[PDB]
């Protein structure tokens, strides 16, 4: 008998429980729907859905009428909407977390074993006819082929939103604190046990490593002076494990939180800015609290940067990426009246989705000089050569490529996308259309409806066989972009919930922690409350370059 | 030279004392409902609320009186209304996410994330204070041992007036030893029970490897053995798990269970046997319903069912007995679905102190005509299989347990534990009993007599401590006067309840996300939880059904 749950019978988040040898049951508890497949709505569920304007309609209003938005951004209504975006978006992400690579059911082990990435939809039952359940071909498209046909960059397509490399590297740096797949354990396993903005990519994903990077004086982090400038310490001074190519000596490697950050000047640039920033804040506190020791200085410094990080991400990073006219705001207090759980768990779907590799350019222009991937990648000297200001101004001026759209991943890193597709299949992620529905969208009815065109659509169709067999990642990247946008509808509708929950679900956002004393007084508190990308860079550099997420 | 201003505990109503400069301090009264330098000026509403709040003692009275009136209420919707009130009101007293730990008397990411630490409600007494308790009392605290033989040592056995028995005393020990599991290797303030709550790790193991060792790996079942045609935990030979049995005891005589320490007492191993029986039983109920299920899902779903069974019996029978209320307590996770509640819990060190209910233990253990001594009971690897579950359950269910509050009621055989508790309290540098009184919404004692309710002990305690404001946390709890005909006094309830209710309702299975019939494998597993009962727990797992209760007949 075919596993009845391969048909994904239960709608609206209802749970498909298998009974007997051939039956199944949908647990529609609190779905707002009744019936065998959770399809008969309640009068209230019926209104709400039938009155909800499409994602596209909303996106429109948010990116138009600058004049209207200007007023709004100046009234209490800005908060009202910000609170709405926050709650509405978050309800989509389950808390406490549900399934993991090992359990497609709730279990104490899933709830407690933090080494697993969680997942929103259980996997495609291993006993289904096809790889995606019931539809599609018995074999899925060669990952590599699929990668060269539709993802490979032919000619560079820049992002129309004006996003640059300063933002592209910020995203890479940022996300690599919570996405840290255990190579030793396999897919579905993470080393980033903080599952969120713990700033472990600065301090270490484990206590020992933290102690190694710590100066143990004034709460300061170790470092070194080169050209009279401050840079991360050497692997010699701070004997921490880093991933540098064989043959590179300790004395020649810089020690930072994330082991992998040595493979790119853009990453190590950001590691330098934040190391600079931690020690700076350590001084502000010491002045205020001479009685404080190293630990408390260190500990309070870390909480301040965590707050700084969450602010800049919401108000500048996400502001850029959304391209909204509504002025986003970071105020943990808008949630103090809501029923919100300050807890977060990195989902595997979120890791797939954040493989924004198409951002990377064809080359890296640093002034009159233009560097190749082969000159940029692994270059252990470019940062100290140019210095923070020089690289920040550079990345801030060079445009980053479009994310959504198709065929815009530079050939040098196209292997990553191939791997992402293969991993998706190991994890046995459900079809793109299932996630569409799961995140409140209607599933695509044709490959053309998805792509918005006819060439690719037709080939994808002849490859997948059924739109209902289109995979999660390919579907996200090949889906048509919103007009003049960096990506399309799905990336926002699916990525935002995961994103907003992970920022607001941080314990420092809870009323219990959001107190001036948590940060060491008004001083530390305002550092958080007023954090800004320019301040972050500029208060830590001899001069202040063009610093922005938008290309000039 | 300048005395740490925070040794004076300046900030009232939960305001935080932040030290500034070399000699200043500041109180963070953010959201305390009080303003001012020391968080002392209330807001109109805070003022009303406090000035209109009837005392703990008044409330306790109403709750234990007017049965006929309680009988009517218990039958209206008014029972849920109050149950929800008790739940929310009680819980707000416990911070979430957690705050301080033995290492940080400030909020920090490490405290928030390092789960090896027990948390704490009040930061320690600054190491730079004049006296050990801050500002008051003598420069040296009472000898722990002395203090223990004068006021805590049992002269004559005082039974609990509430009718609590050994079935309950052992249930409490078994239960609490799943979340209280101090790391001997790491020292005080460190726990091995990383579940920080009702994870049933004292059945399954506090770590994955141990779990795998105890698992049969068939039908989701747990390993076990047949002795006298009855089921008992497997041998350490069969399930090579580390247990704490004195050197010299054959492994052939060691039973392997979740909690390493449960071999020290027939009462503990009795309960480990009932639950092992119960897990496998539920495994069968599910397999029947889901033939397609594998071992893991059977195992996993079985464990969630017993976690629910455990939380129900604790609230409706265990806490019902202990409180002695006429209001019929209820376990319905749904009463909290409208409240702002965080489904998260973290074991506090103060909770560990408070739960050292050692005075419950009797002078000897009567099992029928036979009466056993501590030397025949403790570490007796054969009494359980000899007598069997039914025989011991009926026994413990009939023998009364001793009063907890009051003083002079800890049997000499285990009085050392209380001595250690007092010494540890000082390592952790817990604040004075009066501080916690206030912290949990009570007015601090003004005299040793007001606390004890008499004059003899009071006067000696006074010449020992010097100031009531120097009375330590644990001694204060045990020496404080009991509510009339109660097992303990006001503080044990007002302080222990918040910690307790939060830890039961803060379990993830109580969240709307998990409280679904599918979480338990269908209506079947769901009702097992919804209808759990002490008698069913025992009796559905024993050839016969003995007198089984938390109340002595
Ligand atoms: C010079 C450009 C970059 C290079 C050389 C690069 C290379 C890689 C490689 C090799 C992997 C490792 C796993 C695999 O082989 O599948 C990977 C994974 C990943 N990359 Fe990049 N990447 C770059 C930029 C970015 C950017 C701009 C982002 C977007 C924020 C990003 C996001 C990710 C994510 C989230 C993962 C998975 C991390 C994990 O599971 O631990 N990468 N990248
Ligand atoms: C036969 C009776 C019992 C004996 C032999 C006994 C013995 C002990 C001993 C030796 C300690 C170990 C640490 C120390 O030496 O300070 C201890 C701790 C403890 N006991 Fe008991 N106990 C008994 C009954 C109970 C009961 C009835 C309860 C009440 C529920 C209880 C609650 C506790 C708690 C919570 C701890 C601390 C656990 C930890 O920190 O890991 N004990 N007990
Ligand atoms: C609920 O969904 C099921 C499955 O989608 C529908 O019934 C059939 O179920 C069998 C076995 O699961 C499948 O092989 C078929 O594909 C389904 N047939 C059809 C026509 O969909 C069923 O119609 C749905 N029930 C209700 C009440 O909507
Ligand atoms: C979290 O879950 C993983 C996966 O089960 C655990 O790792 C396994 O542990 C068992 C028992 O120690 C080993 O036999 C396996 O080799 C491990 N598998 C993997 C993929 O590493 C891990 O130990 C769990 N962690 C905790 C803290 O419970
Ligand atoms: C690492 O980056 C440095 C630049 O910071 C590279 O050296 C420069 O190479 C360009 C050629 O494109 C020359 O015009 C510059 O004069 C060089 N400057 C210095 C200071 O060497 C270096 O070649 C890069 N390393 C690798 C392996 O490509
Ligand atoms: C706030 O509480 C303090 C301490 O209980 C009161 O007086 C302080 O006394 C301590 C010990 O003698 C000294 O360290 C301080 O210098 C005193 N206070 C201050 C503010 O410096 C103080 O009067 C209380 N303030 C109010 C308004 O009640
Ligand atoms: C949780 O905190 C404890 C206490 O700091 C950590 O244990 C210490 O770890 C350091 C670094 O490995 C050692 O030098 C000490 O010997 C340890 N102290 C104790 C009392 O064991 C522990 O490693 C932390 N655990 C995690 C997972 O972060
Ligand atoms: C362990 O408990 C058993 C009872 O289960 C003890 O054996 C009994 O001891 C009493 C008094 O000592 C005798 O009157 C009974 O005849 C014994 N009963 C049985 C079934 O043997 C045993 O002595 C205890 N072990 C220790 C070391 O004290
Ligand atoms: C004002 C009262 C309006 C009630 C409208 C109820 C319409 C419910 O429409 C529902 O749509 C699903 C898909 O077609 C079906 O599976 C349900 O049987 C059907 O009732
Ligand atoms: C306006 C024409 C259709 C009106 C249908 C109104 C039905 C009232 O809806 C009620 O909703 C409750 C949950 O919200 C259910 O428990 C009740 O059974 C249902 O009757
Ligand atoms: C102009 C309307 C803005 C609505 C913002 C909330 C987004 C809800 O999004 C689902
Ligand atoms: C709600 C209070 C009822 C108190 C009854 C006290 C008289 C009976 O006391 C028994
Ligand atoms: C009789 C009044 C009982 C009120 C609910 C108990 C809340 C106790 O909270 C202290
Ligand atoms: C605030 C806004 C919204 O909820 O509409 C929003 C928030 C977050 C994202 C976002 C999506 C994917 C990765 C990172 C950020 C996004 F695209 C849009
Ligand atoms: C329900 C009731 C209440 O809140 O009043 C209640 C709840 C829990 C306890 C309790 C106190 C200390 C240890 C274990 C349980 C208690 F004594 C009373």
Swiss-Prot record, chain B:
UniProt-annotated glycosylation sites, renumbered to this chain: 38, 114, 380
Enzyme Commission no: 1.14.99.1
Catalytic residues (UniProt): 177, 355
Gene3D superfamilies linked: Haem peroxidase domain superfamily, animal type (1.10.640.10), Laminin (2.10.25.10)
An annotated Gene Ontology molecular function: heme binding
Transmembrane region(s): 44-52, 56-62, 67-75, 78-92
One of the GO BP terms on file: prostaglandin biosynthetic process
Entry function: Dual cyclooxygenase and peroxidase that plays an important role in the biosynthesis pathway of prostanoids, a class of C20 oxylipins mainly derived from arachidonate ((5Z,8Z,11Z,14Z)-eicosatetraenoate, AA, C20:4(n-6)), with a particular role in the inflammatory response. The cyclooxygenase activity oxygenates AA to the hydroperoxy endoperoxide prostaglandin G2 (PGG2), and the peroxidase activity reduces PGG2 to the hydroxy endoperoxide prostaglandin H2 (PGH2), the precursor of all 2-series prostaglandins and thromboxanes.
Remaining remarks: The conversion of arachidonate to prostaglandin H2 is a 2 step reaction: a cyclooxygenase (COX) reaction which converts arachidonate to prostaglandin G2 (PGG2) and a peroxidase reaction in which PGG2 is reduced to prostaglandin H2 (PGH2). The cyclooxygenase reaction occurs in a hydrophobic channel in the core of the enzyme. The peroxidase reaction occurs at a heme-containing active site located near the protein surface. The nonsteroidal anti-inflammatory drugs (NSAIDs) binding site corresponds to the cyclooxygenase active site. Conversion of arachidonate to prostaglandin H2 is mediated by 2 different isozymes: the constitutive PTGS1 and the inducible PTGS2. PTGS1 is expressed constitutively and generally produces prostanoids acutely in response to hormonal stimuli to fine-tune physiological processes requiring instantaneous, continuous regulation (e.g. hemostasis). PTGS2 is inducible and typically produces prostanoids that mediate responses to physiological stresses such as infection and inflammation.
Record PANTHER family: PROSTAGLANDIN G/H SYNTHASE, PROSTAGLANDIN G_H SYNTHASE 1
Protein name: Prostaglandin G/H synthase 1
């Amino acid at each position: 008998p075919v596993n009845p749950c391969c048909y994904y019978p239960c709608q609206h988040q209802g749970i498909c429980v298998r009974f007997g040898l051939d039956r199944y049951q949908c647990d529609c508890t609190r779905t707002g729907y009744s019936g065998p497949n959770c399809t008969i709505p309640e009068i209230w569920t019926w209104l709400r859905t039938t009155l909800r304007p499409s994602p596209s309609f909303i996106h429109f209003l948010l990116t138009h009428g600058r004049w209207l938005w200007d007023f709004v951004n100046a009234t209490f209504i800005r908060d009202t909407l910000m609170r709405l975006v926050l709650t509405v978006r978050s309800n989509l992400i389950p808390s406490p977390p549900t399934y993991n690579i090992a359990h497609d059911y709730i279990s104490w082990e899933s709830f407690s074993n933090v080494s697993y990435y969680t997942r929103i939809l259980p996997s495609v039952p291993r006993d289904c006819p096809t790889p995606m359940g019931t539809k599609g071909k018995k074999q899925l498209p060669d990952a590599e082929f699929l990668s060269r046909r539709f993802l490979l960059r032919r000619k560079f397509i820049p992002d129309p939103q004006g996003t640059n490399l300063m933002f592209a590297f910020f995203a890479q740096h940022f996300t690599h604190q919570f996405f840290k797949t255990s190579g030793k354990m396999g897919p579905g396993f993470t080393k980033a046990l903080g599952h969120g903005v713990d700033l472990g990519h600065i301090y270490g994903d484990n206590l020992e490593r933290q102690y190694q990077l710590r100066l143990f004086k004034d709460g300061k982090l170790k470092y070194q002076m080169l050209n009279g400038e401050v840079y991360p310490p050497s692997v010699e001074e701070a004997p921490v494990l880093m991933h540098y190519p064989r043959g590179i000596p300790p004395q020649s490697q810089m020690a930072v939180g994330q082991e992998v950050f040595g493979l790119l000047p853009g990453l190590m640039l950001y590691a330098t800015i934040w190391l600079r920033e931690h020690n700076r804040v350590c001084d502000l506190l010491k002045a205020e609290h001479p009685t404080w020791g190293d630990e408390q200085l260190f500990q309070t410094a870390r909480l301040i940067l965590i707050g700084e990080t969450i602010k800049i991400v919401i108000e500048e990073y996400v502001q850029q990426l959304s391209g909204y006219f509504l002025q986003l705001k970071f105020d943990p207090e808008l949630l103090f009246g809501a029923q919100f759980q300050y807890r977060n768990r990195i989902a595997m779907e979120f890791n797939q989705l954040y493989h924004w590799h198409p951002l990377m350019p064809d080359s890296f222009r640093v002034g009159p000089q233009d560097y190749s991937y082969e000159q940029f990648l692994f270059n252990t000297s470019m940062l100290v050569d140019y210095g923070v200001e020089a690289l920040v101004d550079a990345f801030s001026r060079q445009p980053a490529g479009r994310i959504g759209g198709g065929r815009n991943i530079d050939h040098h890193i196209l292997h990553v996308a191939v791997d992402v597709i293969k991993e998706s299949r190991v994890l046995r992620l459900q079809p793109f259309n299932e996630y569409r529905k799961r995140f409140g969208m209607k599933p695509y009815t044709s490959f053309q409806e998805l792509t918005g065109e006819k060439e690719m659509a037709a080939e994808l169709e002849e490859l997948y066989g059924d739109i209902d067999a289109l995979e999660f990642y390919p579907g996200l990247l090949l889906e048509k972009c919103h007009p003049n946008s960096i990506f399309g509808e799905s990336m926002i509708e699916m990525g935002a919930p995961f994103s907003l929950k992970g920022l607001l679900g941080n314990p420092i956002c809870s009323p219990e922690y959001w107190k001036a004393s948590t940060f060491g007084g008004e001083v530390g508190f305002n550092l958080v409350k007023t954090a800004t990308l320019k301040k972050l860079v500029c208060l830590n550099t001899k001069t202040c370059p063009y610093v922005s997420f938008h290309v000039p």
